[PDB]
Amino acid sequence: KSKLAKPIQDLIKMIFDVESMKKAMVEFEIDLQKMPLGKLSKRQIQSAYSILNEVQQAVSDGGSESQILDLSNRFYTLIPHDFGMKKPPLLSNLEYIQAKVQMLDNLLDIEVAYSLLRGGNEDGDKDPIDINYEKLRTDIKVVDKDSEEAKIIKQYVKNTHAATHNAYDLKVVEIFRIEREGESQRYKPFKQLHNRQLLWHGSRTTNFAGILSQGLRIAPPEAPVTGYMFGKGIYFADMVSKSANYCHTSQADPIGLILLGEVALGNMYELKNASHITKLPKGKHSVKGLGKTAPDPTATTTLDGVEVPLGNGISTGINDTCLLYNEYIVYDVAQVNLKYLLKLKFNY
Ligand SMILES: C[C@@H]1c2cccc(C(N)=O)c2C(=O)N1C1CCN(C2CCCCC2)CC1
């Protein structure tokens, strides 16, 4: 049996849950009878990405309906969908194409998790849980719920829930301290930057195998450029609930995982409105999209020399902005050191 503490064992089981992967696929409207979990491949997935890129361009540039039809058929022949009774939606609007891009990002992470699960179980000595754990190449510890550390994170959760995000309250079930192999080393130069902040990143549970094993990643050149409010990078929030939203929990499935990462933001190219950044201005290290509401700066604290904006949310006096709440973007994967993973209970 495993010598990993119960919470960590539970975590590993959650991350590698096969039923979760299938449910994710079903929700994406994939036909699991024609495309089962065990048939997902990296190559076939990458290919869908090019079709979506092409059809997005066609729509954007006013190509022919038949170009669009032709591309739509190719996508669906490659990735079989089940629309049940309904007629298959064509790939002729950008909102839908972006939804499909999102699906592909999730499928890739699911392929990663499934391949890891099914590989390298050769050692009959070690408990399967520990074998799977080790595949995450991440040192994980339970943070004691009655430590100053735990106390600070709990407050960050408590205080920074948004007003408009009132469908649920949020309880911290468990806090893991995590350290991905080689990440400290990768991050080390950015310790020289100022304005290092501890920020939220939410994703579906089914992404965590890829995230822990591979770190947070920036979208391929191959993926359409159209859906990203501030270009392709890694996005974080200072309001717990704006990130928690991206867990895709439900009353039916109320348990999610969310990250806190130290993010080396340096000098922030502050923005109000959409813009596809490809290069950052002179001596800027990150982007901040400014929001109408943000934690009160007067409450911000320091955890291990990283800023924790755990104040209750207040008006920022900025109105000429689209966003309701802040978000922060970096453009180099090395500018992130993940610090904690929280198991969250969404009380709807
Ligand atoms: C931007 C926003 C954000 C802000 C702050 C924190 C987060 C976070 N995960 O915590 C997130 C987050 O996830 N966001 C998504 C980014 C990807 N798009 C999609 C657009 C179309 C192409 C596929 C991607 C949908 C919204």
Curated annotation (Swiss-Prot):
Catalytic site: 327
Domain PARP catalytic: 127-348
Record PTM text: Poly-ADP-ribosylated on serine, glutamate and aspartate residues by autocatalysis. Auto-ADP-ribosylation on serine takes place following interaction with HPF1. Auto poly-ADP-ribosylation on serine residues promotes its dissociation from chromatin.
Domain PARP alpha-helical: 1-118
Binding site for NAD(+): 201-203, 210, 217, 243
Top-rank taxon, per record: Eukaryota
Record localization: Chromosome; Nucleus; Nucleus, Nucleolus; Cytoplasm, Cytosol
Family according to the record: Belongs to the ARTD/PARP family.
Domain comment (free text): The two PARP-type zinc-fingers (also named Zn1 and Zn2) specifically recognize DNA strand breaks: PARP-type zinc-finger 1 binds PARP-type zinc-finger 2 from a separate parp1 molecule to form a dimeric module that specifically recognizes DNA strand breaks.
Record's subunit section: Homodimer; PARP-type zinc-fingers from separate parp1 molecules form a dimer module that specifically recognizes DNA strand breaks.
Protein task: Poly-ADP-ribosyltransferase that mediates poly-ADP-ribosylation of proteins and plays a key role in DNA repair. Mediates glutamate, aspartate, serine, histidine or tyrosine ADP-ribosylation of proteins: the ADP-D-ribosyl group of NAD(+) is transferred to the acceptor carboxyl group of target residues and further ADP-ribosyl groups are transferred to the 2'-position of the terminal adenosine moiety, building up a polymer with an average chain length of 20-30 units. Serine ADP-ribosylation of proteins constitutes the primary form of ADP-ribosylation of proteins in response to DNA damage.
Official protein name in the record: Poly [ADP-ribose] polymerase 1
Gene name for this UniProt entry: PARP1
